[PDB]
Amino acid sequence: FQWATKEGPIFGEEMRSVRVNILDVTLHADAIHRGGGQIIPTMRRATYAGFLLADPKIQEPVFLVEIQCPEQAVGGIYSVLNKKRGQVVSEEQRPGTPLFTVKAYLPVNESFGFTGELRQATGGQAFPQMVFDHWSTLGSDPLDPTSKAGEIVLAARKRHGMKEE
Amino acid sequence: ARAGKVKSQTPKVEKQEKPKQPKGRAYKRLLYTRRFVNVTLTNGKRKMNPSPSSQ
Amino acid sequence: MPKKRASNGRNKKGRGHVKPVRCVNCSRSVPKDKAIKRMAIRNIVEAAAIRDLSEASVYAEYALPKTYNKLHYCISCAIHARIVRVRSRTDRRIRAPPQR
Amino acid sequence: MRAKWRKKRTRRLKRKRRKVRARSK
RNA sequence: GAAUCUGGUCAAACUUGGUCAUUUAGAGGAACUAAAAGUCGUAACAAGGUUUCCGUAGGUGAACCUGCGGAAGGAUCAUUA
RNA sequence: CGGUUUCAAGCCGAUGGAAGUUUGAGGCAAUAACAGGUCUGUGAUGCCCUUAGACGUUCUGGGCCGCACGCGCGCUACACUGACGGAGCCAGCGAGUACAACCUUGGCCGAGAGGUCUGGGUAAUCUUGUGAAACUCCGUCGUGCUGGGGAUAGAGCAUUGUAAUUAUUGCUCUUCAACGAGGAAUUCCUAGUAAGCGCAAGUCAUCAGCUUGCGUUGAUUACGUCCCUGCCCUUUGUACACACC
RNA sequence: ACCCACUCGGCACCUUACGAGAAAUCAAAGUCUUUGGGUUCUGGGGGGAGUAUGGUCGCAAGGCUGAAACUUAAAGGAAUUGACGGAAGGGCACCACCAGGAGUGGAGCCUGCGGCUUAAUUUGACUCAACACGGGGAAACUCACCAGGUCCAGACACAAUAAGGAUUGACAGAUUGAGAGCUCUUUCUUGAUUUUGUGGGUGGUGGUGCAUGGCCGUUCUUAGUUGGUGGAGUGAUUUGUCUGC
RNA sequence: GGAUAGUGGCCUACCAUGGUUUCAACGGGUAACGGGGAAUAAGGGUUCGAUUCCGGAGAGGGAGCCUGAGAAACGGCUACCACAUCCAAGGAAGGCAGCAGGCGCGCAAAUUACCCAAUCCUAAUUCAGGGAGGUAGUGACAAUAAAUAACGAUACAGGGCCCAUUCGGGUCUUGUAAUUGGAAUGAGUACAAUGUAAAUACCUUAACGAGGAACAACUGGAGGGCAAGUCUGGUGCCAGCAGCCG
Ligand SMILES: [Mg+2]
Ligand SMILES: [Mg+2]
Ligand SMILES: [Mg+2]
Ligand SMILES: [Mg+2]
Ligand SMILES: [Mg+2]
Ligand SMILES: [Mg+2]
Ligand SMILES: [Mg+2]
Ligand SMILES: [Mg+2]
Ligand SMILES: [Mg+2]
Ligand SMILES: [Mg+2]
Ligand SMILES: [Mg+2]
Ligand SMILES: [Mg+2]
Ligand SMILES: [Mg+2]
Ligand SMILES: [Mg+2]
Ligand SMILES: [Mg+2]
Ligand SMILES: [Mg+2]
Ligand SMILES: [Mg+2]
Ligand SMILES: [Mg+2]
Ligand SMILES: [Mg+2]
Ligand SMILES: [Mg+2]
Ligand SMILES: [Mg+2]
Ligand SMILES: [Mg+2]
Ligand SMILES: [Mg+2]
Ligand SMILES: [Mg+2]
Ligand SMILES: [Mg+2]
Ligand SMILES: [Mg+2]
Ligand SMILES: [Mg+2]
Ligand SMILES: [Mg+2]
Ligand SMILES: [Mg+2]
Ligand SMILES: [Mg+2]
Ligand SMILES: [Mg+2]
Ligand SMILES: [Mg+2]
Ligand SMILES: [Mg+2]
Ligand SMILES: [Mg+2]
Ligand SMILES: [Mg+2]
Ligand SMILES: [Mg+2]
Ligand SMILES: [Mg+2]
Ligand SMILES: [Mg+2]
Ligand SMILES: [Mg+2]
Ligand SMILES: [Mg+2]
Ligand SMILES: [Mg+2]
Ligand SMILES: [Mg+2]
Ligand SMILES: [Zn+2]
Predict the structure, then answer these.
(1) Distance set, CA A61 to CA A133, A135, B37 (Å)
(2) How many domains does chain C have?
């Protein structure tokens, strides 16, 4: 079980959260003379099919970002987030008027050159300070193309090295 | 698990507050006496670490 | 495998590598030494004649000769039936001609 | 396998090896 | 009695090759070894069901087989006249 | 006693003798084992099962018995050495109830099966001479799937049990199938044995083709050999020793 | 041409070995831990490998010469006892065969076990040594199988209700196969026995006879088994337990 | 003959054809500086020797040379290569395989400390200097020496026993108790004086400095090889140990 959970079929990657069954399981037993080998990857070919036949829409990062913005400027942070699949969780109004924060979920998939997009928008204003938070699910089917998760999957398996699916 | 499963899976018993076995010569003084001077009981042959008499 | 025998092939001692003789049955070339050279002095007529032949015959006393097949056998071929007869380790030292 | 043939085996293996190294002069 | 300077000489090093040694990428090939244990047979060991072997030729799907010669480590220390 | 045999161990033939096959038969039966079989004889049992929706227990109905079809013990026959009637008519092992319901004579009823009254018996006493069968005698049919052979069937009459259809068994009449001595194969057997015949207890409330006992009738043919099969030693070989899977 | 005795040269056996040797054996393989006559050569676990390479030689095949990396705990040798052998002799036994009998296999029918089928047709046992066996001839019981219901037979320990009831019972019809209080309809009984949990057990014809005991079966009722000295061997062992009859 | 301090195929001319070799010439390798020695340790040996002494080499390479008795010096110079410094771009300066330090490499190795007082060395030299050399620091490279309590008493048990009508005193000697009690001790600090170039540390002590909580021994092992667990909980062919067996 520990693999396929560490090394799944669809992605070529781990995780989560898999029941997974089990019923019945016909042995004979024996002595055997059985896996560790036979049962050591019988489960693997099983848990792949249990993964596959369900659905898996696939999960993703997402790094909480909390930026020390000024008020008179830094609307542009919002446009930077709206771009990236981002959800602002909060907009904490500080006692000092020229300081703010914007606690926000941001996928790490989409946060490459994040600061670069932030800097140009804000005009070098507001200081990113992001951190990891929590896994967020996607809506894309993996086998089916033209989907956010599926495109990521096809790219990820090409980075590992096939077979397709 | 498949990586140091047993090391975790045991109940750790704690080091009991038992008295200091003496060091250097006084340690020898035990072992001299616990073989030569005291002389342990023997049914047939001599034995240096006994068992509680059972199967 | 140590020596079964001291002789082995037998005649050959002080004598490089002698000539061989085709066996009788198998036609198995065997040295004329390893050969099991039995002598088959058989009558020209089988015992259960012989009367019958002498009854119908001309003359008296008659030739009544004996054919002289000096046989050979490839040891294996011999064991399968013939004089050989797998002896005991201690008995294998005996060279005495058997019977008699 | 029988040692005479294990000898014969490695005789061919040589004669193949001779054609291989002769293919590059 | 300076720089300067004409031959020599020692000869670094470079240049552009040639050559030995040691290293080291190398597509490919062809091996050999470990093996969870799978196919195909079952060669050898019992006269292992064509006795094994060796040398050496040929052939094969693999063990292997088949000539020739040899050896028993043979399945025989034995047939007398 | 006689031969016979290094005139040993013994074997073979006569005599007598109840007995001359270890007198006949069993009973026990060594070393070492086998991964034989038994966790469904077991409050004999280790540990995995389970432990109240119990895989515990208990009721109630089924099911083990179903049938294209494979083999395996068995029974009945393929008849005239018989079948069917009568008649004659001789055994042995056994077994059997009082707190239950056993064996159950004798008498009446019923073609039967089976009822009923009554007994005798806790048993060399009664059942029981268990007058069992096959047998022996006189008749019917004579070698025709015939009176051989009884299977399949229908209906009833009984009996056990709370309950009988998936006939429990018995009896009644009817049905009359296959099968004219069985191929390849292979089982069992050497004397009161085989083969025939029945009895008998065992299980059983009820069921006998079953079984462990019993007695009746009683041969054929060896009284040897290693041809097959198996086993055993012995010598030999063995790269085997979880031992030719 | 022999006989007989002894002799130089050649080729091999017998017995004891007191000498060697791991032993088989060997009068050389002796005169070697009591280690030294002279000389040449070869070997240093197994494999990888007589391979790779390089020579060198060959018409070539091939030879001579000759590696390591890597790999591995054994590879051997000799013998001992086993087991086994489509090796050879010598036995035994109607579970072998002859000389015969009775048969079975065919026929029908019982009754085992397959196979199929089924809701279940419960399972064990599969050459002798599973297959009319489980004492197993099952109408329910037996009964383990299936369809359905019932019961606690939940020992003891600790706690939550502790009588303003802990819980037990319950005719009537629907309910239910059903004079099962099985319950839902009911509103009367019952008095701390228990019931709800958590430890813990108890039972289980559950599982595994390849975790075991006992009993059995089977090798085999075959004739095998063992030791004590004494010998032979360093030794495992062996001889005793054997040519014959 | 030439050169050299000098001998010489050291170099040059002319001449001769020698020279070495299976008693291994020549070639190659060396994770080779030689020797003294080291470890091992019956005898014979094997392997190691970069390294405290003695030779030899080298100062990034390879050359060439000045001065000088002595240099083919490199804490001299000239150059070329290799590496690199400092720049006002014209040009300058270099050579830790001295000491210390750092990088780098690597499994792998110390402080840019205090001194000439010793040891010696050098000079124009009693007088100066000396990372030669010494002094500490760091230092489990090695090696040497040895604390981790000792003596009581009372309190509970083992051993001798005057005698063993049953005991038991226990007159005599040993072991166990968070009893308790007196008597030391440098591990440390610290006036001092030692020590010392100055200090440290050592040896020596004024003054304090032990009572189980302190002023505390770890490492490995505990089936065999091979000394020693069939103890208590887990674990359950796994995880692991195991030189080998396992
Ligand atoms: Mg051998
Ligand atoms: Mg052999
Ligand atoms: Mg000759
Ligand atoms: Mg010759
Ligand atoms: Mg010049
Ligand atoms: Mg043959
Ligand atoms: Mg074969
Ligand atoms: Mg063969
Ligand atoms: Mg060999
Ligand atoms: Mg008897
Ligand atoms: Mg068994
Ligand atoms: Mg049980
Ligand atoms: Mg049945
Ligand atoms: Mg029977
Ligand atoms: Mg009677
Ligand atoms: Mg008829
Ligand atoms: Mg038998
Ligand atoms: Mg080797
Ligand atoms: Mg029956
Ligand atoms: Mg019945
Ligand atoms: Mg029971
Ligand atoms: Mg003895
Ligand atoms: Mg014996
Ligand atoms: Mg001169
Ligand atoms: Mg060097
Ligand atoms: Mg050296
Ligand atoms: Mg040196
Ligand atoms: Mg060096
Ligand atoms: Mg020096
Ligand atoms: Mg340098
Ligand atoms: Mg220089
Ligand atoms: Mg210098
Ligand atoms: Mg220098
Ligand atoms: Mg330095
Ligand atoms: Mg060091
Ligand atoms: Mg120094
Ligand atoms: Mg220090
Ligand atoms: Mg001290
Ligand atoms: Mg320890
Ligand atoms: Mg331990
Ligand atoms: Mg030990
Ligand atoms: Mg350990
Ligand atoms: Zn022949």
Answers:
(1) 8, 5, 74
(2) 1
